[PDB]
Amino acid sequence: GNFDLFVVGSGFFGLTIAERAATQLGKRVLVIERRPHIGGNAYSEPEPETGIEVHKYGAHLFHTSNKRVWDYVRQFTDFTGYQHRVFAMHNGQAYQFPMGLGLVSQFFGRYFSPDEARALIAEQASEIDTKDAKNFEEKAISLVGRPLYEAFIKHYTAKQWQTDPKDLPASNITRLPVRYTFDNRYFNDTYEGLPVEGYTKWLENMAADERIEVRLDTDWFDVRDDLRAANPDAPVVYTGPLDRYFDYAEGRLGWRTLDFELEVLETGDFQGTPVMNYNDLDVPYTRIHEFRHFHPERTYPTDKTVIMREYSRFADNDDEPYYPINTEADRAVLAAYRARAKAETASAKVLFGGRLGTYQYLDMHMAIASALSMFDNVLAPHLSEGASLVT
Amino acid sequence: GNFDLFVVGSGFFGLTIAERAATQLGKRVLVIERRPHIGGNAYSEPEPETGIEVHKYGAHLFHTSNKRVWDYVRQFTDFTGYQHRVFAMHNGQAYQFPMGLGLVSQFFGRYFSPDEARALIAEQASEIDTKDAKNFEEKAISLVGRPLYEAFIKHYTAKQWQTDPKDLPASNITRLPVRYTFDNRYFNDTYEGLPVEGYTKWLENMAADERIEVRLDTDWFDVRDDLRAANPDAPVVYTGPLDRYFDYAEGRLGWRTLDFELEVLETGDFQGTPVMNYNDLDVPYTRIHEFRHFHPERTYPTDKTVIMREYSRFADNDDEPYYPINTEADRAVLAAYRARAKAETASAKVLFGGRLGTYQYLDMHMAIASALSMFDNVLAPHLSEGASLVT
Ligand SMILES: Cc1cc2nc3c(=O)[nH]c(=O)nc-3n(C[C@H](O)[C@H](O)[C@H](O)COP(=O)(O)OP(=O)(O)OC[C@H]3O[C@@H](n4cnc5c(N)ncnc54)[C@H](O)[C@@H]3O)c2cc1C
Ligand SMILES: Cc1cc2nc3c(=O)[nH]c(=O)nc-3n(C[C@H](O)[C@H](O)[C@H](O)COP(=O)(O)OP(=O)(O)OC[C@H]3O[C@@H](n4cnc5c(N)ncnc54)[C@H](O)[C@@H]3O)c2cc1C
Ligand SMILES: [Mg+2]
Numbered sequence: 215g216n217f218d219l220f221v222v223g224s225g226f227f228g229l230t231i232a233e234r235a236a237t238q239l240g241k242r243v244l245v246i247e248r249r250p251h252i253g254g255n256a257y258s259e260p261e262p263e264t265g266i267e268v269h270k271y272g273a274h275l276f277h278t279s280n281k282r283v284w285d286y287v288r289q290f291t292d293f294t295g296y297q298h299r300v301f302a303m304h305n306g307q308a309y310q311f312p313m314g315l316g317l318v319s320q321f322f323g324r325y326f327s328p329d330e331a332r333a334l335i336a337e338q339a340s341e342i343d344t345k346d347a348k349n350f351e352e353k354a355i356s357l358v359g360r361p362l363y364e365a366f367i368k369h370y371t372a373k374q375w376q377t378d379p380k381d382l383p384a385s386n387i388t389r390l391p392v393r394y395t396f397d398n399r400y401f402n403d404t405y406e407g408l409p410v411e412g413y414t415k416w417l418e419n420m421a422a423d424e425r426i427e428v429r430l431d432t433d434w435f436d437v438r439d440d441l442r443a444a445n446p447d448a449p450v451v452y453t454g455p456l457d458r459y460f461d462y463a464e465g466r467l468g469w470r471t472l473d474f475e476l477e478v479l480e481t482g483d484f485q486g487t488p489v490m491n492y493n494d495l496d497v498p499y500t501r502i503h504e505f506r507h508f509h510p511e512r513t514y515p516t517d518k519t520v521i522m523r524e525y526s527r528f529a530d531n532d533d534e535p536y537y538p539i540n541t542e543a544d545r546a547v548l549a550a551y552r553a554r555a556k557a558e559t560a561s562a563k564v565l566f567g568g569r570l571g572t573y574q575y576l577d578m579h580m581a582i583a584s585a586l587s588m589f590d591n592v593l594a595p596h597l598s599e600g601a602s603l604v605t
Numbered sequence: 606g607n608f609d610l611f612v613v614g615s616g617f618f619g620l621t622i623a624e625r626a627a628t629q630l631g632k633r634v635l636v637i638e639r640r641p642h643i644g645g646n647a648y649s650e651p652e653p654e655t656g657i658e659v660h661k662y663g664a665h666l667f668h669t670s671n672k673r674v675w676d677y678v679r680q681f682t683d684f685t686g687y688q689h690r691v692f693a694m695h696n697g698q699a700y701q702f703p704m705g706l707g708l709v710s711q712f713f714g715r716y717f718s719p720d721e722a723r724a725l726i727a728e729q730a731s732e733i734d735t736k737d738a739k740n741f742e743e744k745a746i747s748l749v750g751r752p753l754y755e756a757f758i759k760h761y762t763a764k765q766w767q768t769d770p771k772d773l774p775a776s777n778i779t780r781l782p783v784r785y786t787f788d789n790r791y792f793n794d795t796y797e798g799l800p801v802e803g804y805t806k807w808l809e810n811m812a813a814d815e816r817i818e819v820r821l822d823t824d825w826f827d828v829r830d831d832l833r834a835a836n837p838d839a840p841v842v843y844t845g846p847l848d849r850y851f852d853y854a855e856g857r858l859g860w861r862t863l864d865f866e867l868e869v870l871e872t873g874d875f876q877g878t879p880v881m882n883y884n885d886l887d888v889p890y891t892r893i894h895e896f897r898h899f900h901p902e903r904t905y906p907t908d909k910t911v912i913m914r915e916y917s918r919f920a921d922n923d924d925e926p927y928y929p930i931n932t933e934a935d936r937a938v939l940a941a942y943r944a945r946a947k948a949e950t951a952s953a954k955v956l957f958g959g960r961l962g963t964y965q966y967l968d969m970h971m972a973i974a975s976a977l978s979m980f981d982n983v984l985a986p987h988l989s990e991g992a993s994l995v996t
Contacts, residue, residue: 376921528921530767 616645
């Protein structure tokens, strides 16, 4: 049939756009998705042996301080009262985390009060002067001191960035706070929780409107010419890779990827907490997720659990792209593609959005906020009142 | 104590050198090995749950037509009568392999005699003229025809090389024979078998002589200065990476790596043969190894088996290097390092050998042949009669 709007990609950005067009302007929307499932990287699914919901592209924790977004998402799902907390494994011991009075007292072997901890860190971090810092390693030492740096930062950084911290620029550290309280709540956003029926149901609700069609297993580039010949005045919101859209004509944007190993174990509980960071070099993974703990309210089985080991890697051409590397070279490459994108927008009615469309890491709430904004300020005016898509 | 000779690396090249020096010249040899085990990539070990011997760095099949090598290795191990055969999985069917009368009859649906098969291939391969071939894909079609190419070569090549076959040079295909008989013995060497007590015992026997010390978990670069200060007239045979030896001063040599996934299944037999190639794009691995079938003479358990999925990847800086990529750029980089190596040989008594030391893929028998030759023609003359190490 006929379409008023094409959305490429069914992640949170894509589905926010598609939903808002359908329900707020009455528009016919086609969502083209190349994967065999919707939801982009927020997709979740039960592990078969155990029934436990697993986040297939990495652990997804929802948090936001944006009231508008919080009100928007709650139309599609309820949230549990989950609060994220993380522990760290170093030299055979499990530490409270992030760095705070708990970790400090554990690591140094006795209670440090807020004033005493402040004094300790100050003294140890004085080894290097921050403005003299030549690189990441030195800057981190100049902020938290060498003992804490070498125990909980050095090797974890090396694993996560796949680069020796001495070869990372000092530039990539703004602050490196130690909490001078025992508060170990990981995020400090106003709103936080996990979707009660899980992420996939949430995303399916966003696509529920009759005026939205979702075509899975479909690559936009395989179908666009005849789809747009069908509906020439239909604008496009594209949330796939930016460099691919222009046939890599400016070069490939660099990304980091993640490898996961899912394992079902014959115990009811492997580590007693959702996420354990592994700070030492003697194991190759950065973190282990245990998914039963994301939803304690669920009646999961008692004799099995599923865990997931996470590993960091530079992305090869065909790896899933997760984090932009963002070298100067990358930023110059990006610069060229957004010029192309602005010209494609003006000439072909194609908007570029989302994590892949803009070469940006985006949290779920930031992707949603981004899409709501594109809708309100660029796309809806066009669809409703013929306004230009040129900014 | 004192040493007459340093060998860096305890793979087949290294241990051949160390053994020949110890037993044929009476020399004190120290082998420095950075891994926690000896044997280099030929190392094997029993999987714990099943007891089954697994080749930890890929399936290792011994074959040679070199009588000297065959006589040499049999001093350290007995061989079984194993003959390697490979099958290929395409579109839900298992095919005899390599391409021959069996595969051809299966694939085309009826018996083709030697003359008829010859005629078939000739006709189909005539689609493209070999000298007109613009790339790998076209050259392969010009040799075996499009139907066979698209079924058993196209996607397997894409997976193994991590490159679209249209973007590989025609240059990388010499011949692509179809066997016009039913003979499916994989290798055509005079001698073939598997070590009766397994690869690790074999390698341990090579290092058995009292005059050989093996230090595990030791990086040559961490220890060389004081080791050589200890024994200044001791020559060195280095079989680690060539580019690393000279601090990557000419750039990094490019390699391909392999990823493996070991799995123990609750069946006595998963695929009924040691190696199954997967020629289709719908699975990411290239091959599955089932190790019980490498040693049918062993009394392995009946209710479990261990398999290994193999995947191809370009090597990152810290991946295990398995196959040289060998671009023109790589060959120019290599060229510079062998000039450096020749100067290091003349000035510091350091020989460069083996797979890593020469940027070469070497089969086991070719590594051994190589080391025997370095011994006889370069190193033994030096150790015995003070001859120069300069060639
Ligand atoms: C490991 C990992 C962990 C994360 N953890 C969190 C977290 O804890 N909390 C949080 O708030 N956010 C988290 N995020 C970000 C989260 O996934 C966001 O929902 C995501 O960034 C949403 O942005 P997006 O919709 O633009 O991208 P995506 O979710 O990637 O959606 C893009 C969709 O576009 C499809 N597509 C791409 N190309 C084409 C094409 N040619 N044709 C058709 N379809 C195409 C893709 O298949 C994909 O489905 C995490 C991300 C990752 C990778
Ligand atoms: C998947 C794979 C499959 C293979 N299959 C076969 C087969 O089927 N049949 C066959 O004949 N051959 C096969 N081979 C080749 C086989 O492994 C050979 O025995 C190997 O090439 C022997 O050559 P080498 O001794 O020079 O290298 P290696 O076996 O790699 O030995 C090198 C040793 O040097 C050590 N080392 C490196 N750097 C240092 C350092 N700075 N300090 C101290 N020690 C160091 C390394 O840890 C390593 O142990 C295969 C190889 C691979 C990767
Ligand atoms: Mg890589």
